[PDB]
């Protein structure tokens, strides 16, 4: 016989993401790039790695869209909700939404694409909210507008514990 594990996390090391669609504010280079960069901020503090599927049902669903679509997490509109995302496991397990009623940049205008995913990844993987206002996981978005991407300390713990 066999029984479901407490604590949700991946027990395979070689996960696989595919992006459905694209928002409007970035060019597709710019979206996939960006998507990258997310994933590699967690890659480099795990054993874990990330492969990009153009095709097929991936690990890791990622998909744009606005207000009410397909599931209990409803967007908002502009601000608010910036995205969410399923914890691990099968069916929509990892799968992370993102809300194309905002402005998605490359920059510290409207809100990175890049420093989102890294957050909603981090539930991908099985982490929750912060109580730490300087914590990437966080529940509110604080562009700190550094020149480059640190990953904070307690990020680190927390993806520690899990793997
Ligand atoms: O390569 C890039 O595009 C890039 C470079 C540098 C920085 C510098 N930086 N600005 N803010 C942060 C930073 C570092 C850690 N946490 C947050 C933050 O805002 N966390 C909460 C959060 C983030 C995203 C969504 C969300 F709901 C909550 C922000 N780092 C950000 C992005
Ligand atoms: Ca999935
Ligand atoms: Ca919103
Ligand atoms: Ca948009
Ligand atoms: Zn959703
Ligand atoms: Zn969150």
């Given at each position: 016989?066999?029984?479901?594990?407490?604590?949700?996390?991946?027990?395979?090391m070689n996960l696989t993401y595919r992006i459905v669609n694209y928002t409007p504010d970035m060019t597709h280079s710019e979206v996939e790039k960006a998507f990258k960069k997310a994933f590699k901020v967690w890659?480099?503090?795990?054993?874990?790695?990330?492969?990009?599927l153009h095709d097929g049902i991936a690990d890791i669903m990622i998909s744009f869209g606005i207000k009410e679509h397909?599931?209990?997490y409803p967007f908002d509109g502009?601000?608010?909700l910036l995205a969410?995302?399923?914890p691990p496991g099968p069916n929509y397990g990892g799968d992370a939404h993102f809300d194309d009623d905002e402005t998605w940049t490359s920059s510290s205008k409207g809100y990175n694409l890049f420093?989102?995913?890294?957050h909603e990844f981090g539930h991908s993987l099985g982490l929750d909210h912060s109580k730490d206002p300087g914590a990437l996981m966080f529940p509110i978005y604080t562009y700190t507008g550094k020149s480059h991407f640190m990953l904070p300390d307690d990020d680190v713990?927390?993806?520690?514990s899990l793997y």
């Open positions: 016989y066999n029984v479901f594990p407490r604590t949700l996390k991946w027990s395979k890659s480099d503090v795990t054993p874990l790695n990330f492969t990009r397909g599931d209990f502009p601000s608010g969410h995302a399923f420093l989102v995913a890294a713990q927390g993806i520690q």
